[PDB]
Design a binder for this molecule. Structure first.
Ligand SMILES: COCCOC(=O)c1c(C)nc(C)c(C(=O)OC/C=C/c2ccccc2)c1-c1cccc([N+](=O)[O-])c1
Lengths: 11, 223
């Protein structure tokens, strides 16, 4: 999950 | 002042901190379950800046991806508080903090939770902290080795350790004549831990009133 956290971190 | 490699590190969190709100509580006048939208908006502003700082932290990106998450989810509340204290004491003109507290006491959010919040803010206010202290300390909170569901604890220490050695030496020279000051600052990390308990408890009450939370808050807090 934590799809949005992953996105915001992987940038 | 400070070591070659340490000066570069210090001079990099700090710029990171400089570059990624309250006044609606100050006027349309309001305390709230009815105004709950204001809260989540604020928390959400907090969570977004938390994330953008944590990326910039040295070696953070090199950690396991699940450990990465645990540190974030582990640190949202503490950082939300520690940042509010820098807003409350360091940045607001005279009179604003006073109305703010009183507006909040009117929130229908009970002192069991309110009084610790304000005593914590005063205590740290009275500590008269610089931006470097607030920044570095923020980064120490985030890199807390002991958070739950961490797989490789030893990787996170080794990442916090360097930040701690900067801060000791920093206090040593710019609160010379106060060798206890560095311990005082660390006690604030201890102090912050308690707010998670309160969070949990407050969060649980808001689900029983079926409150709406933003996407982001949904993820960071498992609602
Ligand atoms: C004592 O331990 C628990 C204290 O922490 C929490 O209760 C707590 C929890 C558990 N979840 C959340 C989402 C919040 C939160 O939104 O913000 C804390 C910031 C307060 C504040 C706001 C503006 C300027 C300066 C400070 C707080 C909370 C608490 C009280 C009052 C308020 N507030 O409406 O401002 C919020």
């Amino acid at each position: 999950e934590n799809a949005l956290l992953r996105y915001l971190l992987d940038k | 002042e400070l070591t070659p490699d340490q000066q570069t590190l210090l001079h990099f969190i700090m710029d990171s901190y400089n570059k990624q709100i309250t006044n609606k509580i100050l006027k349309e006048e309001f305390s709230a379950e009815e105004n709950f939208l204001i809260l989540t908006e604020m928390a959400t502003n907090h969570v977004q800046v938390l994330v953008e700082f944590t990326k910039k932290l040295p070696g953070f990106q090199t950690l396991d991806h699940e450990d990465q998450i645990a540190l974030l989810k582990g640190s949202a509340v503490e950082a939300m508080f520690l940042r509010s204290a820098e807003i409350f004491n360091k940045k607001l003109p005279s009179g604003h903090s006073d109305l703010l507290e009183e507006r909040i006491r009117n929130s229908g959010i009970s002192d069991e939770y309110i009084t610790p919040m304000f005593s914590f803010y005063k205590s740290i206010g009275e500590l008269k902290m610089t931006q470097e202290e607030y920044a570095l300390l923020t980064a120490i909170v985030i890199l807390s080795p002991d958070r739950q569901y961490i797989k490789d604890r030893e990787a996170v220490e080794k990442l916090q350790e360097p930040l701690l050695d900067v801060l000791q030496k920093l206090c040593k020279i710019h609160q010379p004549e106060n060798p206890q000051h560095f311990a005082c600052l660390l006690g604030r990390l201890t102090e912050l831990r308690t707010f998670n308990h309160h969070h949990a408890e407050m969060l649980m009450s808001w689900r029983v009133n079926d409150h709406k939370f933003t996407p982001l808050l949904c993820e960071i807090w498992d609602v």
